[PDB]
Structure 1
Amino acid sequence: SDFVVIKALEDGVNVIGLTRGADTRFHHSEKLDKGEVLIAQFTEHTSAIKVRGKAYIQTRHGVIESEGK
């Protein structure tokens, strides 16, 4: 199973997990402050991940950046 790496480039970045299945909703929001790194899988409970806030992101398709608010 795949994972994404998220490094917060400012305070208060959210890494948000969306529910797997017929229902889609946020089930968790992980707050990152500046310089922290989260490495998060897709899972039986999370089939999509949203990042909000300025962050440097790595996936198997390469580098992407989210831009803040």
Structure 2
Amino acid sequence: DFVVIKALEDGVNVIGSECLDKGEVLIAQFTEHTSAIKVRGKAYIQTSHGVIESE
């Protein structure tokens, strides 16, 4: 599957180590290499299980 991360503030880090500014949206698929995704800062995540808001 895949996750959808909308960065609600600048400098949101996404560690597979990408960085997003405010208003961007990263749609990330899971690979063999990427087995865990850690999200820092204020962001809005949509997964298959629902939505969540990281701070």
TM-score by length of 2: 0.95
Unaligned runs of 5+ in 1: 17-28
RMSD: 0.5
Number of matched pairs: 54
The structure in which a higher percent of residues are strand is 1
Which consecutive aligned stretches of 4+ in structure 1 deviate over 3 angstroms post-superposition?
Answer: none
**Structure 2: distance between partners of 1:66 and 1:13:** 10
**Structure 2: distance between partners of 1:61 and 1:47:** 17
Instruction: Decide which structure has the larger Cα Rg and report it.
Output: 1
TM-score by length of 1: 0.76
**Structure 2: distance between partners of 1:43 and 1:65:** 23
Unaligned runs of 5+ in 2: none
Q: Post-superposition shift, 1:44?
A: 1.2
